[PDB]
Amino acid sequence: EEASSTGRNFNVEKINGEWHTIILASDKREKIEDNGNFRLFLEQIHVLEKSLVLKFHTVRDEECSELSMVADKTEKAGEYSVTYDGFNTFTIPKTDYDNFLMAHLINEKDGETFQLMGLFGREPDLSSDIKERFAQLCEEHGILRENIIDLSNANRC
Ligand SMILES: COc1nccnc1CC(C)C
Numbered sequence: 140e141e142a143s144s145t146g147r148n149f150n151v152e153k154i155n156g157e158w159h160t161i162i163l164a165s166d167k168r169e170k171i172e173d174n175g176n177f178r179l180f181l182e183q184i185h186v187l188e189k190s191l192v193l194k195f196h197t198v199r200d201e202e203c204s205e206l207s208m209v210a211d212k213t214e215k216a217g218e219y220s221v222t223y224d225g226f227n228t229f230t231i232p233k234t235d236y237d238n239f240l241m242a243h244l245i246n247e248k249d250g251e252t253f254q255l256m257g258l259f260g261r262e263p264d265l266s267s268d269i270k271e272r273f274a275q276l277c278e279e280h281g282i283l284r285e286n287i288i289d290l291s292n293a294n295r296c
């Protein structure tokens with residue numbers, strides 16, 4: 140079964156646990172390139188009553204830096220907000236809970252904005268078919284494939 144965080148049948152408890160960043164995509168590519176602040180490697184999602192605790196790490200000169208963020212539910216069901224390199228809101232347009240999770244995030248900083256999309260997997264990689272479904276979701280948001288970066292061979296410290 141699959142669901143969207145904005146959907147009626149969404150079960151947030153089921154996204155709790157281990158996750159890995161498989162692919163990141165953005166209409167401002169610099170944000171996810173080397174040293175971009177959004178080149179984030181997810182490790183875990185802890186589901187709480189009204190928030191999600193996100194554990195990530197970034198990498199600089201082959202050195203891993205841990206970071207934790209708390210995302211709070213907003214007034215729209217399935218949407219969360221979090222302060223990080225600006226103000227962010229995000230939703231999960233599609234997840235099957237057991238294998239993949241696709242997220243769409245809007246960042247706003249210094250009066251600007253950009254879209255960030257992410258494909259996260261329970262294991263350190265996902266099938267080529269799920270990677271293709273993710274490229275199609277990115278296309279529905281106006282994000283070109285050339286702005287989609289597979290990080291499955293760069294997600295372990
Ligand atoms: C694009 O998705 C994201 N990107 C950066 C930070 N958080 C998210 C939300 C996910 C982890 C649910």
Ligand SMILES: [Cl-]
Nearest residue numbers: 275276278279
């Ligand atoms: Cl489509």
